[PDB]
């Protein structure tokens, strides 16, 4: 293959590669293995020259498939000492895009292979820092590895993702580091790296508000909402008083789609603060979620009220009943303040009257006399 590459018909070379793939595709090499380092380096140089020649496209894919089948023990032990020896960044990125697919097909037996390769991949992520494509590919690969599964490797990958997220200031790198922090929050929901959600809100949500059509907000705000909901779903009581900025981002996320935003709101509703939502919704209902008047958070403000009014109201809501009827009075008073689309204002007033009827059914006899 290197002789043909140093030589370079093209369709003749493609037919030669397809005949090579149909000839080579194995267990002969497996019976040779089970010397060994020489065979690993020989198949690694074969695969590296194969990617340098192929980095008729389906014929090149079949040749790479035969090379990946013959050359995840072998695919891991080849690249583990050659993740620096892969010279060009294009060959490195193609090798990383093949290695995760060849690795995450089967697992659950050999944990220590990935547990000692995770430090190597995180060091390759820290060394190849000026290659953003390789950085995002390493982020996706390490996130898939943490979803497959090691405390030192977990802390190293989490710190690399936190440093790739906090000082990111780049669209694709920030979106990729947010996914790595999300998968690490799903795997090891540690209390450490406390500067995680407070950095993500004021960084990414404000950046998506500042970038109107320049950046991919359809690629940014959805992942930001999923990360903000997954963090509070993992650590419930650690954000039982810090939920207001999360609800503000999930409500004013105009880039987020309707079903995704509704699912995020439902997850935040069934999440923490079963009583502390009545002391939380009032600030957004006064200042935040009622000054927009572009229907986006207007569809969701009454839904966020109805969630805690029809799924969480209890004796704790009877104890905190004053803010409940206070928010009811503010909602019934803001009708003329909502001065756009008066028929929709009447529809929202009907929804507010129904939620107020539910709150009045929840409120008992002695609890509402001063409220009366």
């Amino acid at each position: 293959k290197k002789k043909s590459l140093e030589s370079r018909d093209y369709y003749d070379v493609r037919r030669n590669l397809r005949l090579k793939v149909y000839s080579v595709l194995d267990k002969k090499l497996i019976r040779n293995i089970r010397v060994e380092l020489t065979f690993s380096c020989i198949t690694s140089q074969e695969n590296e020259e194969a990617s340098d020649s192929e980095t008729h496209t389906t014929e090149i894919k079949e040749i790479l498939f035969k090379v990946l089948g013959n050359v995840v023990d072998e695919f891991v032990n080849a690249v583990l000492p050659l993740l620096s020896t892969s010279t060009n960044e294009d060959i490195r990125y193609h090798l990383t895009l093949v290695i995760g697919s060849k690795f995450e097909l089967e697992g659950s037996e050999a944990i220590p292979i990935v547990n000692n390769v995770m430090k190597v991949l995180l060091d390759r992520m820290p060394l190849e820092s000026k290659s953003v494509v390789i950085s995002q590919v390493i982020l996706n690969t390490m996130t898939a590895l943490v979803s497959k599964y090691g405390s030192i490797l977990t802390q190293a990958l989490t710190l690399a993702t936190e440093k790739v997220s906090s000082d990111m200031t780049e669209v694709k790198i920030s979106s990729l580091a947010l996914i790595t922090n999300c998968v690490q929050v799903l795997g090891v929901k540690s209390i450490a790296f406390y500067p995680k959600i407070v950095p993500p809100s004021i960084k990414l949500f404000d950046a998506s508000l500042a970038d109107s059509s320049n950046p991919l907000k359809e690629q940014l705000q959805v992942a930001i909402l999923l990360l903000f909901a997954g963090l509070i779903k993992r650590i419930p009581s650690f954000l039982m008083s810090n939920i207001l900025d999360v609800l503000h981002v999930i409500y004013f996320s105009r880039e987020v789609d309707s079903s995704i935003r509704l699912s995020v709101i439902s997850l935040i509703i069934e999440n923490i603060d079963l009583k502390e939502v009545l002391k939380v919704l009032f600030r957004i209902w006064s200042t935040e979620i009622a000054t927009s008047n572009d229907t986006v958070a207007v569809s969701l403000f009454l839904s966020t009220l109805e969630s805690t009014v029809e799924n969480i109201d209890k004796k704790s809501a009877t104890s905190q009943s004053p803010i409940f009827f206070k928010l009811l009075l503010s909602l019934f008073e803001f009708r003329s303040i909502s001065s756009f689309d008066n028929n929709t204002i009447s529809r929202i007033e009907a929804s507010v009257h129904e939620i107020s009827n539910s709150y009045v059914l929840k409120m008992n006899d002695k609890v509402f006399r001063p409220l009366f």
């Binding site: 497996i30 097909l105 089967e106 992942a223 995704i260 509704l262 229907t295 109805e306």
Partner: protein, 82 residues
């Protein structure tokens, strides 16, 4: 290109645990309110379907590779006893 493909891949990997799909403002509000009623879905059933499909592919690959290792052990014991 590859940037958009990897972005959609990371987005779908994040929303894999979400299982979601992907001016008459009174109609928009009523549709968004009834979507809370429609949100009682069978996402646990579809996640069980995807998880059973992944378990099936994992068991298929593991059984095929273990049979390949059995043939490797038979060939190595043959070439050893020879």
């Amino acid at each position: 290109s590859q940037t958009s493909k990897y972005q959609a891949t990371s987005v779908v990997n994040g929303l894999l645990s979400n299982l979601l799909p992907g001016s008459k403002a009174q109609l928009i509000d009523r549709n968004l309110k009834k979507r809370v009623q429609l949100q009682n879905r069978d996402v646990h059933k579809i996640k069980k379907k995807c998880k059973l499909v992944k378990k099936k592919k994992v068991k298929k690959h593991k059984l095929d590779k273990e049979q390949l290792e059995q043939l490797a052990k038979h060939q190595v014991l043959k070439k050893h006893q020879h």
